[PDB]
Amino acid sequence: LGSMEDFVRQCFNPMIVELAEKAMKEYGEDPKIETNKFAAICTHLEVCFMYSRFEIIEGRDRTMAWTVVNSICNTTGVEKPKFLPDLYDYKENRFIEIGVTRREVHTYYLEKANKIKSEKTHIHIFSFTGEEMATKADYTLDEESRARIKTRLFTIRQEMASRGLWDSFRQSERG
C-alpha cells in the first residue's frame, strides 16, 4: 500500500499539484493528511484543462476568477453565476460546471444542478467507467475529445491500483 501524496506529486503536473495544493490550503485542508481529496482535486483540475473558445476559471485565485467571470458577464449580457463555473464557452456563450465522480453519474449530476441554480450553466459529468452525462444531451465536445478524457481517468485508476491506492480512493467520496 503506497503513499498517495507520493503518487499525486509524481503523477500529475507540477502546475496541477500546486494549484490544487494551493486550492486546499485556502480551506485549511492539508494535502499530507487529506490525500485522497488531494488527488481528486488534481484529477478534477486536470480534466478541466483538457476540456479546453474556452476561458478557464478553475485554477485561478478567487479574486482572479471572479474578475474573469465579470468582464465576460459584463461584455456578454450573460447572467452572473452565483457560485463559480469551471469554464466559459464562447461558441455556446455559456458557463460550464465540470464534475468528475467515482460514484453514480446521475446522483452527482443532480447534486451539481441543484447547488448552482443554473438556468444557463451547462453541466458535464464524467466518471472512471466511461459513464458520463451532459445537461440536455449536449456533449459540447466531439466523441474523440471526450474519449481522451475518458482514457486518462482509466490511466489514473490503474496507476493508483498499481500502488494499492485505487481501492480507498474509490470509496471515500461524499457530497
Rounded to the nearest whole angstrom, what is the least distance from the CB of residue 16 to Mn ion in the complex?
14
* From candidates 58, 88, 102, 133, binder to Mn ion by CB under 5 A: 58
What does the alpha-carbon distance between residue 120 and residue 170 come to, in Å, rounded to a whole number?
A: 31
Binding segment for Mn ion among 11-19, 29-37, 67-75, 81-89 (CB under 5 A)? 81-89
* From candidates 8, 45, 98, 156, binder to Mn ion by CB under 5 A: 98
* From candidates 86, 102, 146, 169, binder to Mn ion by CB under 5 A: 86
Q: Is 47 left (phi over 0), alpha (psi -120 to 50) or beta?
A: alpha
Annotated binding site for Mn(2+): 44, 58, 86, 97-98
CA of residue 133 relative to chain centroid, distance:
14
Rounded to the nearest whole angstrom, what is the least distance from the CB of residue 132 to Mn ion in the complex?
14
Question: Phi and psi for 99 in degrees, rounded to 5?
Answer: -135, 135
Rounded to the nearest whole angstrom, what is the least distance from the CB of residue 1 to Mn ion in the complex?
29
Question: Phi and psi for 82 in degrees, rounded to 5?
Answer: -70, -35
138 half-sphere exposure, CB direction, 13 A CA radius: 12
Where do contacts with Mn ion occur on this chain (CB under 5 A)? Answer: 58, 86, 98
Active site amino acids: 58, 86
